[PDB]
């Protein structure tokens, strides 16, 4: 269509944001070998 959506984060309160005011999220997916994909990244 004209537009589409891409999952970029989980929904959560983050402890580390509470402490410093701002925290980058750590939402990771792992392939078969244990390699990380960073969901939160705008280029993922």
């Amino acid at each position: 269509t004209d537009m589409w959506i891409e999952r970029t984060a989980d929904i959560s309160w983050e402890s580390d944001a509470e402490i410093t005011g701002s925290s980058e999220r750590v939402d990771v997916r792992l392939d078969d070998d244990g390699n990380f994909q960073l969901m939160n990244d705008p280029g993922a």
Binding site: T1, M3, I5, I11, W13, S22, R25, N40
Partner: protein, 169 residues
């Protein structure tokens, strides 16, 4: 040509992308809860959305309240309690997602009253969810309005949960 089916509705936070003349860009953000995608009316103005192997079509919206949802009725039910700080799950175009903590203010509506945040992010961030200490979505990041000093505040966009008739296939 199998776009006769409901697309992926995994719970989470999403970027809303679209095609321009020269490539793709982020039009907004939204939140998927209970198999329903929630965003501001202004981000898509009702356009259908591809998600995974299927489609999401607009289900209900209010232009006046700047609310729009796909795949079912408005599911978000929690509201800012008026005291606690909140966290915005900031989905800024071209940036990694971050949580930002902030104290909302109550600001003077003619038609009642509304919570607003002083956080100022680009309009492509609009529709990013705002959560309370339980991770419950208390609203969406609205489009900013200008203050006397030239700074911007943004409404916490939220309304009542709406009912769905019992599903059958």
């Amino acid at each position: 040509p199998k776009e006769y089916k409901k697309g992926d509705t995994t719970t989470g936070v999403y970027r809303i992308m679209t095609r321009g003349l020269l490539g793709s860009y982020q039009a907004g953000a939204g939140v998927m809860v209970e198999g329903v995608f929630h965003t501001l009316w202004a981000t898509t103005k009702g356009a259908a959305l591809m998600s995974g192997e299927g489609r999401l079509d607009p289900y209900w919206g209010s232009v006046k309240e700047d609310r729009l949802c796909y795949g079912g009725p408005w599911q978000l039910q929690h509201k800012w309690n008026g005291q606690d700080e909140v966290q915005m799950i900031v989905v800024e175009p071209g940036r990694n997602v971050k949580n930002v903590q902030t104290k909302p203010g109550v600001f003077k509506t003619p038609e009642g009253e509304i919570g607003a945040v002083t956080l100022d992010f680009p309009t492509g961030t609009s529709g990013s969810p705002i959560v309370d200490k339980n991770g419950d979505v208390i609203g969406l990041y609205g489009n900013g309005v200008i203050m006397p000093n030239g700074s911007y505040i943004s409404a916490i966009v939220q309304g009542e949960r709406m009912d769905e008739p019992i599903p059958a296939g």
